[PDB]
């Protein structure tokens, strides 16, 4: 499972992470959670089955497959977005759970 | 709501050591327990899960054959045993529950309560 | 109730972990366990509806079922005890009988659920595929994970693989 | 000299049936009385014989 | 050459109701109403009831001269009487709290 | 409810007194009735567990139900007729709508149970007996006494005869 | 529960306004609703019997609920409230639960009804008819409106369109 | 203490009639069918009549055929064989059989698991 | 119906009894029932429906089918085994239940 | 819809009136109810769905279908059975419920 | 029974409203119809509603000019004429149909039928 590294956004504007697999294709099936961390408070959920967001969550975190790969979209980024994203698949054919390298958002 | 882990600490290289995991405020017997740990500086990585009654029991390829995961409904308590731990095994574990319906329990389900974590060194 | 829970399909599926129905398909690509997400959820939604209705239904004021008679009042005592009595006795065999009638009723409903899938998929692959019995589907066409993914959509392209279909046939 | 569970003014009930069309007043463990003229269950098909 | 699937009829007259239609008639059914007795006085939990023929409660317990016959019994599960027994209160009187004593009197250890 | 008793079986057979449901075949050896043991043992085994969980699920505690009470005491036997009527009338009602809605599902389990038996033979021979309809199939090869018993038993083999049913069909 | 009502027919028909299921045709002679008068009217009756069954099977005797008791009489109230309590909490779960499985019975008879008939005319037209999915049938040979009037009555002649239907098949 | 009675039985003349009663104590008598069996001095078990437990069903064997009528009557828990044209062959011990009913269903194939002690008849000038 | 007239077994050993149709196969639809019979007493129930054991029947008894054939199996023969014993066989289409012959067994 | 303007017929008779389409067939799903009314008396249903009669409608009173039309026959005719008769039938094309022109009974 | 009430002299291209009130019956578990008889000529079906009068249909005739509508708790049912021509002077009637507990549908049999009012649109 492959993230971007690093990626930034400006105040206000929209960035889309990106969760991709090594050989293959991000699709429903793999129930992608996405995580916000920030060094060193535990990991806090923020999207799950690409769509579903719990509550206390701001509306403006989005969730959808754009393709093969799974997208997490924040439109309006704040200041306290500025963290690290990590993002669940679930494998069935060894039966695992793998997340993402993380990627460091830097609000500008 | 809240999760709590205990154990951890420095431990030899080839040793072994519990991590314990008490829930308090809800139900324990109705969710799944997972365990994740973060190195220093490093991503997370899955470790382990158990089912609501303990008859299943899943595994990473990394920790397959060293660690155990067992539950204690009565106490409240989920357990991750470690053997055979060499320095790559220095993180931070933590225990994530899995948000599940009332009506069905399942392996996929989402990791949305965490705990502060605790944190191992295995060093000499 | 509808043979399919343990009728054509004998049992179940423990590699499947992330859902109460779903698909096992196998072509070049690989092989893999998917559930129905639309299936499991409505599924999920019935029983959830079921059990609130049950649980959520009794509702009860705020009363005290203790009471204190003196020797020479017998006649309210024993009123007092068949009332309460019969309360039991009825609330006791409705739950008794309620429990057992609706575990018939859920596992019926997951069987038809079951059914229902599998003649959905019948439906889609109307000669293209060959039934084998035990729940599965072999095509006469070769099928990749698009058309897997096709498949357990809802969108099957039938006049796509028609003529390799009939050829293999 | 005859030992039963249920009694009646007019008699006594042996019998495990839950439910009972006698008397609404009785002494011991008795079935429940009802004002159904029958209960009958069905264990078998419909009978339909060419 | 042929095999057809089908089921069992026979000549049974048994009836039953059913929420959807009324009065089918059904190859075997069973019986949750019991509406026949045996027409005796039996014994219930092990114990005899305790006979007052041609006695009342008051009578037997106050000691009617003509409803002495009566066996001395150490116990009785229920008492059977008679409607309008004759022989109660030979002289004429009011019985205090007379059904809190037939009550406490019905079953005695 | 499944469209088998009164569905495309319009009539029972009085000729098979050994079961509830069974095959009726026809060959050059004979003709006669036979019962499905599984099906009807199965359906035997539910049906017995149903009345038994109505009958014995009702367990009655010592009690007596007649109180005397004076001319003065009217409120209490007013009191005491209120609650006799009042279990008399929940009891009744409760009889006899259960009794109605397992009449129902008694009925429905047997529909189930005699189509469920008509899809499992269907599936076993394929192309290798036609339907004429009415709940019988027309064989397209010579059929004896041990491939009915196969096919009655559940081991029938299609690849045997799959070639000589297909020069007659 | 039998994938009809909402399976692989989506939406009902507002045109046909004479019955609950039906038929809807398409010839040279015409298009128009019909509806089943068979199985309307075997549904209405058998819904006016459970309806009738719910209501009826109440029946309840001349009682008054209301009573008086003094002040040094709390105990009395106190066990007359239990017992109307008692009683309205059961009559309440009782009806609420009722109401609810009848009603989720009622639409699985409605959808039994749907597939029943759609397999009746499944049945009937074996292979003279395609199959469009929608529970539509498109027939290999003209059917006029004598063809459809038998169609819909029970009464189809397969052998007369047999060799037509080859012809375009 | 379940158990069958038969009685009815004697010397009677080749073209006479005869009428065996099987009274059942101990077990509900309206819920198992009711067969006859006989069994000559020195031969075999013979199977001859069966009736269902309400009686509307009835069953010969082919060589009693047409002579033997079984009839029960539920209300007095006995079941009766009238036994017509009675012949020299006839001469036999009469056994009644009940067969082991289940609580759901009762069939003609239910196993004979009650026999009663028997009845003599006897056929002759 | 077709019995073996009589058959003889040593105390303590193992023996077979067969029950066979004179022109067909006996197969679990015939339903075969095995009954012994003191020479005086009314017979007993032994085995039904070919592998069932009524109530204070012995272990030792056993029934199955060979082949074409129903098998009565007697494992350890006592002394109290010496009796008749008769099958019955339920044949569909005349609609009867037809008892056999009759086996003598000797201990 | 149309109908026959007039017929008659003696006392104690047999009369059947039809109701037929101007193009097509008539049959049970077109659900033909017939009205009889007096000039100066709202109508009085007598047969619907073509065999259904209310209660009080004298037994005489029949319906039927017969060659694409629906037939109202009454057996029997009585001096109060002088009126005029409409047949009411469905259309589920346009959908409606269309009266027949109407017939005049002479008895 | 049903009563009809609320006609009388309309000039042309007139309005008029018409209502029914049905008394010893349901109001609500019925369908209603209208239907209108001229003097020397036959019955017309008009109109119907449906029970709750969720459902509204109509003749080619009076399509478009006329407009049935129900009012169940004053048990009544309303026909509004608009722009009245010379051709409806009839007698209008109101016709309940025969309506199942279970279902009511748009083919119920007419069984009662109200007295009726006469409308006469003339100058």
């Known amino acids: 499972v492959i993230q971007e590294p690093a990626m930034s956004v400006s105040l206000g504007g929209t960035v889309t992470l990106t969760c991709a697999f090594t050989s293959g294709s991000v699709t429903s099936s793999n129930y992608p959670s996405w995580f916000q961390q920030t060094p060193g408070q535990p990991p806090r959920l923020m999207i799950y089955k690409t769509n579903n967001r719990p509550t206390g969550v701001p509306s403006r975190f989005s969730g959808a497959i754009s393709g093969n790969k799974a997208a997490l979209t924040i439109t309006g980024a704040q200041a306290n977005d500025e963290a690290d994203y990590f993002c669940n698949l679930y494998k069935s054919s060894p039966i695992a759970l793998i997340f993402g390298g993380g990627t460091h958002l830097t609000v500008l | 709501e809240k999760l709590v882990e205990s154990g951890g600490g420095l431990v030899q290289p080839g040793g072994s050591l519990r991590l314990s995991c008490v829930g308090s405020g809800f139900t324990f017997s109705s969710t799944y327990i997972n365990w994740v740990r973060q190195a220093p500086g490093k991503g997370l990585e899955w470790l382990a899960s158990i089912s609501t009654s303990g008859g299943s029991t899943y595994y990473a390829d990394s920790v397959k054959g060293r660690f155990t995961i067992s539950r204690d409904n009565s106490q409240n308590t989920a357990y991750l045993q470690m053997n055979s731990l060499r320095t790559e095994d220095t993180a931070r574990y933590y225990s994530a529950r899995g948000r599940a319906a009332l009506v069905a329990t399942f392996f996929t389900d989402p990791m949305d309560l965490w705990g502060p974590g605790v944190e191992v060194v295995v060093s000499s | 109730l509808f043979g399919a829970i343990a009728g054509f399909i004998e049992g179940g599926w423990t590699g499947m972990v992330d859902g109460w129905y779903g698909y096992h398909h196998q072509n070049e690509q690989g092989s893999g366990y998917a559930a129905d997400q639309k299936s499991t959820q409505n599924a999920i939604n019935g029983i959830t509806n079921k059990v609130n209705s049950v649980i959520e239904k009794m509702n009860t004021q705020f009363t005290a079922v203790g009471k204190e008679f003196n020797k020479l009042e017998r006649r309210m005592e024993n009123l007092n005890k068949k009332v309460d009595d019969g309360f039991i006795d009825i609330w006791t065999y409705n739950a008794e009988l309620l429990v057992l009638l609706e575990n018939e009723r859920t596992l019926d409903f997951h069987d038809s659920n079951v059914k229902n899938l599998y003649e959905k998929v019948k439906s889609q692959l109307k000669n293209n595929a060959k039934e084998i019995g035990n729940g599965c589907f072999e095509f006469y066409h070769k099928c990749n994970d698009e058309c897997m993914e096709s498949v357990k959509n809802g969108t099957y392209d039938y006049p796509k693989y028609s003529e390799e279909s009939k050829l293999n046939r | ?50 | 050459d042929t095999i057809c699937i089908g089921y069992h009829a026979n000549n049974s007259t048994d009836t039953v109701d059913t929420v959807l239609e009324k009065n089918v008639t059904v190859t075997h059914s069973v019986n949750l109403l019991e509406d026949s007795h045996n027409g005796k006085l039996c014994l219930l939990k092990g114990i005899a009831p305790l006979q007052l023929g041609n006695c009342s409660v008051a009578g037997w317990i106050l000691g009617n001269p003509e409803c002495e016959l009566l066996i001395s019994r150490e116990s009785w599960s229920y008492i059977v009487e008679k409607p309008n027994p004759e022989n109660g209160t030979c002289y004429p009187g009011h019985f205090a709290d007379y059904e809190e004593l037939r009550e406490q009197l019905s079953s005695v250890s």
Not at chain 4, 13 to 29: A, D, M, R, Y
Request: with cysteine.
């Open chain 4, 1 to 50: 000299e005859c030992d039963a569970k249920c009694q009646t003014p007019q008699g006594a009930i042996n019998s495990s049936l839950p439910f009972q069309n006698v008397h609404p007043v009785t002494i011991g463990e008795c079935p429940k009385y009802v004002r159904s003229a029958k209960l009958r269950m069905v264990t078998g098909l419909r009978n339909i014989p060419s």
